[PDB]
Design a binder for this molecule. Structure first.
Ligand SMILES: Nc1ncnc2c1ncn2[C@@H]1O[C@H](CSCC[C@H](N)C(=O)O)[C@@H](O)[C@H]1O
Ligand SMILES: [Zn+2]
Ligand SMILES: [Zn+2]
Ligand SMILES: [Zn+2]
Ligand SMILES: [Zn+2]
Length: 869
DNA sequence: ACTTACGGAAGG
DNA sequence: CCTTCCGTAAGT
């Protein structure tokens, strides 16, 4: 069975009543009733201090009875402000100024606090915690109800060792409401409202301004540089532009008885289709920044314009989008075509280098930093040719990381190639995943052990495990990464209310107890997207509450993995936490353009929408990775492949394949092995057409001679489906007595050995017609979310090869996840598929790791600048 | 060990 | 109304 969650007392007292039967024991507060705010109307609410009462009586609100219970004024001090309607609680403010405004009366400047019940924490927060917000306004002194004592609960100097342990308002963190960020209080140097200073610094970062005038002309004036959103651009720099900023000179009835299920295809929406993905950014080289002169004879310093030399992508030339198949993802062509755009349109700065002018090689230059492009040739669109460009065209220590619920190590691998971490410890109960981690991380300690048992060992002074493996003590772990089991949070689990999924979900508590005990600098929790909305977003709320209770800067978000370099839709919830002395990391900007339907990443918690700090919504520097970029070089293999190590009959064909294979010649291809489906499943896969969007619904209703001694029989429609109606020939469409609403199934309408699987028309009407089951991938599209078992009749069943009559291999699944072709998997084909489908795609972990590297560099620079004072 | 039959909430 | 998609019990 499953063990109970090991807890510190801090985490226990928060997750107490939620996992009442799952955490090891030694007003529930979490029900839907205990989560709504106080009413404000009743004589109970108007007697607690939040609404301007006495408070001598407790008298809980008369809507929050849990169904699980038994039954002078001087600047610098904080005050209460009563709003119009009394049902909203007292607004807590700080006095930043106390001027006497003539003609208006006594006045002051209120810098607002945010109560904990007004944040993403909701009712989970304690009624005394406050949060700093950039919210101020001038109010009359007629509004002060009373003077409030507010304390600044700072983290101690031994905060990193406080894992394991009145009635005045306190605060520790600043709150950003748009992104639900909890950060340290901003160090702002001196009225002096802090919110006013921060908003004034923000408003003078929004405004683009030209700098260092270059040459004065009659109708305009050139400038050498400009600045926008804190980014400085000069003449000759590369700029990102929206795909609409300029243009290129290159001119851009079935047989319903043969196919009785084809009628269920009436949406025309194709899973994994890239026909609606946007174009990547336009790339320009700034030839001149200029401002037009007003009628007064001097420049308009707000109408900043830039002239730009256009760059072509290989898919922008006359040739075709096939030109993008083998080309580099950051390869361009120089053009002598120019375009004038506005400075407000620029989406960022890039680097466009002439290829054979570089001191490095273009392969080492391309991996050096972000936004790096190169070109070798100039494109002539009027003659549709390529020449060489003209002359005016040329010219920290690693964190010590503990990975809990490691698996095969996709998150650790992504963090390792980001250069930020050194995974020294891994906890992985499942033995094949632990062996894969040992094969991919020869210098780590993998604990093949339950995380609860190991945490209970380390919270006592045991210092070593049974096999004699040195456990990590507090002080060893600078980074704690992990993805706890998602099986109880997934939207595919239809038994998520049973003890199995309860004990799956209780491992988030174990992970948070690791975070509490070890107090690392950085903490990463990864889960499926449904982690943020499971059980009314209460697990997310309680996790963020635990984090802010420890004293952590924390933030949550959702990231689409395909926006970072994989041909796969995979939306994942990410929780980032930083110790009080750190910078809270930002989530990474999308690198590749991805299908807009796969990019819904906002999170609604308690009827409030939270986004991430991401700004790249539509476009991006790079083009989408496709199925052909992923597996167009893997040789032909058959259903039920068993040969582990085979040959690469050829070289890589796309940029993605060169990235995943490398440059050193390795003619060994491992794990291009497919599941061995039965004869009926094989005949079904044989009869799925090759056209895109093909799935079980264009199966033929014929009898087929299987490979074994069996004839797959014909599906019979024995009942009338009053919702689907009848076919053109008058044939029925129901397969069980369930089709008549208000009737039970019949244990005689179940039909076996059919080419069309009976269960799919049986329950298709309430399951989106099982769209995608026995579905093929298209070469121009992307994968669907790679799960631990590619099953053509699974909930995610779009796993058929584009051309071959089989299921995607282990190599193709690892490539849809962004795993290097040298990454080691272990066990039988099911173990390998499970390792691959459980992992975090290494490109996503690499983007997040670079965002953590930013904060590590920032802290190091701040230490240096405070050391040479 | 293998194969199938398949609930319901959230977000657009 | 349609689409999502780290999968689970139960049968065999
Ligand atoms: N109680 C527990 N103790 C230790 N490991 C556990 C566990 N429960 C589940 N696991 C492991 O957690 C793993 C899933 S997380 C593994 C994938 C990881 N996100 C990655 O990027 O590679 C599974 O392999 C499972 O064996
Ligand atoms: Zn009340
Ligand atoms: Zn309750
Ligand atoms: Zn102010
Ligand atoms: Zn039925």
């Amino acid at each position: 069975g499953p063990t109970k969650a090991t807890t510190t007392k801090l985490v226990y007292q928060i997750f107490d009543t939620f996992f009442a039967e799952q955490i090891e024991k030694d007003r529930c507060g979490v029900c839907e009733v205990c989560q709504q705010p106080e009413c404000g109307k009743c004589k109970a609410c108007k007697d607690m201090v939040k609404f301007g009462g006495s408070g001598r009586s407790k008298q809980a609100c008369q809507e929050r009875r849990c169904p699980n219970m038994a039954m002078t004024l001087e600047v610098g001090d904080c005050v209460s402000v009563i709003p119009d309607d009394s049902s909203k609680p007292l607004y807590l403010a700080r006095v930043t100024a106390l001027w006497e405004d003539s003609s208006n009366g006594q006045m002051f400047h209120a810098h607002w606090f945010c109560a904990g019940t007004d944040t993403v924490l909701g009712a989970t927060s304690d009624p005394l915690e406050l949060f700093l917000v950039d919210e101020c306004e001038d109010m009359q002194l007629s509004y002060i109800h009373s003077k409030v004592k507010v304390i600044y609960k700072a983290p101690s100097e031994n905060w990193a060792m406080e894992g394991g342990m009145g009635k005045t308002y306190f605060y520790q963190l600043w709150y950003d409401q748009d992104y639900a960020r909890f950060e340290s209080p901003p160090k702002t140097q001196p009225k002096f409202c802090v919110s006013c200073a921060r908003l004034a610094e923000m408003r003078q970062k929004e405004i683009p301004r030209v700098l260092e005038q270059l040459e004065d002309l009659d109708s305009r004036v050139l400038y050498y540089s400009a600045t926008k959103n804190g980014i400085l651009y000069r003449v000759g720099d590369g700029v990102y532009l929206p795909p609409e900023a300029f243009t290129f000179n290159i001119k851009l009835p079935v047989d319903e008885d043969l196919y009785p299920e084809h009628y269920r295809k009436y949406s025309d929406y194709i899973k994994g289709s890239n026909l609606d993905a946007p174009e990547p950014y336009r790339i320009g080289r700034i030839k001149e920044i200029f401002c037009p002169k007003k009628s007064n004879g001097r420049p308009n310093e707000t109408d900043i314009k830039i002239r730009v030399n256009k760059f072509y992508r290989p898919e922008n030339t006359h040739k075709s989008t096939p030109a993008s198949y083998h080309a580099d993802i950051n390869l361009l062509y120089w053009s002598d075509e120019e375009a004038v755009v506005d400075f407000k349109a620029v989406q960022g700065r890039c680097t466009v280098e002439y290829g054979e002018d570089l001191p490095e090689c273009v392969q080492v230059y391309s991996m050096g930093g972000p936004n790096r492009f190169y070109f070798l040739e100039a494109y002539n669109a009027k003659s549709k040719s390529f020449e060489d460009p003209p002359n005016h065209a040329r010219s920290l220590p690693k964190l010590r990381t503990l990975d809990v619920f490691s698996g095969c190590g996709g998150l650790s691998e992504g963090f390792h190639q980001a250069g930020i971490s050194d995974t020294l410890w891994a906890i992985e109960m499942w033995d094949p995943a632990a062996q894969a981690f040992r094969l991919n991380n020869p210098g780590s300690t993998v604990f093949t052990e339950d995380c609860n048992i190991l945490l209970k060992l380390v919270m006592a002074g045991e210092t070593t495990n049974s096999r004699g493996q040195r456990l990590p003590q507090k002080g060893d772990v600078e980074m704690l990464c992990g993805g706890p089991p998602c099986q109880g949070f997934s939207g595919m689990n239809r038994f998520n209310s049973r003890t199995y999924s309860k004990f799956k979900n209780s491992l988030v508590v174990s992970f948070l107890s690791y975070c509490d005990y070890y107090r690392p600098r950085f903490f990463l929790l990864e889960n499926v997207r449904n982690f943020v909305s499971f059980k009314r977003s209460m697990v997310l709320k309680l996790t963020l509450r635990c984090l802010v209770r420890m004293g952590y800067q924390c933030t949550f978000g959702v990231l689409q993995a395909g926006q970072y370099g994989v041909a796969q839709t995979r939306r994942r919830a990410i929780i980032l936490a930083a110790a009080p002395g750190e910078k809270l990391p930002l989530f990474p900007e999308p690198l590749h353009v991805f299908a807009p339907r796969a990019c819904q990443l906002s999170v609604v918690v308690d009827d409030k929408k939270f986004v991430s700090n991401i700004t790249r919504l539509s476009s991006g520097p790079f083009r989408t990775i496709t199925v052909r970029d992923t597996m167009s070089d893997l040789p032909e293999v058959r259903n039920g492949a068993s040969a582990l190590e085979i040959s690469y009959n050829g070289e890589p064909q796309s940029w993605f394949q060169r990235q995943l294979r490398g440059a050193q010649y390795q003619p060994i291809l491992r794990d291009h092995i497919c599941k061995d489906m039965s004869a009926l499943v094989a005949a079904r896969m044989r009869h799925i057409p090759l056209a895109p969007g093909s799935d079980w619904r264009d199966l033929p209703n014929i009898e087929v001679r299987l490979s074994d001694g069996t004839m797959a029989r014909k599906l019979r429609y024995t009942h009338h489906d009053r919702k689907n109606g009848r076919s053109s020939s008058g044939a029925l469409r129901g397969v069980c007595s369930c089709v008549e609403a208000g009737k039970a199934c019949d244990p005689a309408a179940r039909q076996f050995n059919t080419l069309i699987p009976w269960c799919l028309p049986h329950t298709g009407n309430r399951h989106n017609h099982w769209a995608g089951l026995y579905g093929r991938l298209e070469w121009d599209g992307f994968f669907s979310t790679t799960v631990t078992n590619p099953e053509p009749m699974g909930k995610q069943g779009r796993v058929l090869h584009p051309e071959q009559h089989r299921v995607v291999s282990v190599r193709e699944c690892a490539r849809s996840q962004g795993f290097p072709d040298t990454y080691r998997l272990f066990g039988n084909i099911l173990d390998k598929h499970r390792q691959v489908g459980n992992a975090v795609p290494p490109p996503l972990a690499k983007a997040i790791g670079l965002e953590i590297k930013l904060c590590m560099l920032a802290k190091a620079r701040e230490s240096a600048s405070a050391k040479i004072k």
